[PDB]
Scaffold this active site. Structure first.
Site, PDB file in Angstrom:
ATOM      1  N   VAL A 100       0.847  -1.182   0.000  1.00  0.00           N
ATOM      2  CA  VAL A 100       0.000   0.000   0.000  1.00  0.00           C
ATOM      3  C   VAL A 100       0.888   1.239   0.000  1.00  0.00           C
ATOM      4  CG1 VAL A 100      -1.870   1.203   1.148  1.00  0.00           C
ATOM      5  CG2 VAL A 100      -1.723  -1.273   1.362  1.00  0.00           C
ATOM      6  N   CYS A 101       0.487   2.255  -0.754  1.00  0.00           N
ATOM      7  CA  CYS A 101       1.175   3.558  -0.703  1.00  0.00           C
ATOM      8  C   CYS A 101       2.637   3.320  -1.096  1.00  0.00           C
ATOM      9  CB  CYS A 101       0.926   4.189   0.667  1.00  0.00           C
ATOM     10  SG  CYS A 101       1.512   5.887   0.857  1.00  0.00           S
ATOM     11  N   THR A 102       3.596   3.945  -0.417  1.00  0.00           N
ATOM     12  CA  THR A 102       5.011   3.808  -0.709  1.00  0.00           C
ATOM     13  C   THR A 102       5.601   2.490  -0.233  1.00  0.00           C
ATOM     14  OG1 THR A 102       5.339   5.227   1.218  1.00  0.00           O
ATOM     15  CG2 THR A 102       5.433   6.277  -0.985  1.00  0.00           C
TER      16      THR A 102
END
Ligand SMILES: [Cl-]
Ligand SMILES: [Cl-]
Lengths: 227, 230
Positions: A100-102
């Site tokens: 998820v995300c970075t």
């Protein structure tokens, strides 16, 4: 016979990246969910909220699903050889490798995006290509058994997809109904394509120092993979 | 140009549905002029309904006067609806809070605290019949606003109403910046988040599974209503 699901829990994580899919997946039958760090004990999220790791790397059972969240703490992880080795080892035989995300930049630093379609948080998306990824600007990107999501709750959505593949669609639908997961945001600024122009510029400015720092980390991580 | 902090408190109780709390916490904690709190009897570990362990940051007595209070739901609500110390804290904080809010069956706790009398409100769909005995005007919408009260039934309704709170506490551009900085843009892969849209078989199994809890919670609700003054 239980499905083993593990989230990496690291200092300065964006906690909702993890806690969202955790509550979905922990609702399923025949699953055991782990919060993994170097030892069990408290780990402080970027907001200050304290979570508890439940297992060390060495004691974690072989995982069927691994999930790498994002957040401020990703930069350190991208240059943490012990964490990267753990991720590689688990990914080598996991049914699903997710982020998820970075968190996808951590997968990238571990070498696991080489030649793979992937996304990340919109403000850092330029960092995917140096890590070997084929960048894709979509909310959840799937390539084989790899699922990456950009936004803070993307793991909630892909957790329902995983539920349907691990069990069946009716099981995913039952979890959605039991939790009454029915989002309806009151604004439409969750994408740089739809937010006001001034909002895009200000969000970018607030991320600029982090992006500059992560550009250099990403270049070093890529160079280490090549060498 | 004020930078006076907005004190935002979440009640963190045993067997909470953690996502009810952790969603709005992460949204609101991203704002420069918010200070968030996780409140219980004492600081220390609190185990959510999944077994995930959270950490309360303050006792009731040490909590600063709140500008926003948020009550989550979960399996632990039944006990909380008959916890006099917790209900008293909620009443005291609600009396001076700019916004009084809840997620899921957290609204049944607001009801047990006497804060829903004559107020439009919602809760989790499986427990919605428990609102009327607590004095509420039941409303079947995702987020219901009445005065300074906001209630939402779904597990992430607090994420959505947190953006509304950000817009009113600060301004719309600030709420939009939060949404973009966190890239909050949900897109569920199924459409089963309501009994009105889920497959019939799924609704049947969810209702059957909740039946024992609904029965017990009705008994609790009636006692909580009896304790309300007048
Ligand atoms: Cl509940
Ligand atoms: Cl999202």
């Amino acid at each position: 016979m239980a499905v083993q699901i593990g989230f990496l829990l690291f200092p300065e994580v964006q906690q909702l990246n993890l806690t969202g899919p955790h509550d979905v997946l922990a609702s399923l039958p025949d699953v055991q969910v782990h919060l993994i760090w170097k030892e069990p004990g408290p780990v402080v999220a970027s907001s200050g909220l304290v979570l508890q790791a439940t297992t060390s790397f060495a004691d974690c059972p072989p995982l069927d699903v691994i999930c790498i969240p994002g957040g401020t703490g990703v930069g350190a992880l991208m240059e943490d050889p012990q964490a990267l080795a753990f991720i590689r080892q688990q990914a080598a035989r996991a049914r699903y490798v997710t982020s998820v995300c970075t968190g996808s930049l951590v997968l990238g630093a571990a070498g696991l995006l080489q030649g793979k379609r992937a996304t990340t948080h919109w403000a850092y998306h330029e960092l995917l290509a140096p890590l070997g990824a084929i960048p894709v600007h979509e909310r959840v990107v799937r390539d084989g058994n790899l699922l990456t999501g950009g936004g803070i709750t993307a793991g909630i959505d892909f957790a329902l997809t995983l539920a349907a593949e691990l069990f069946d669609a009716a099981t995913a639908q039952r979890v959605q109904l039991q939790l009454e997961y029915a989002p309806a945001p009151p604004f439409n600024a969750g994408s740089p394509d739809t937010a006001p122009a001034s909002v895009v510029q200000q969000a970018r400015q607030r991320a600029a120092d982090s992006l500059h720092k992560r550009r250099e980390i990403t270049l070093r991580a890529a160079a280490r993979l090549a060498a």
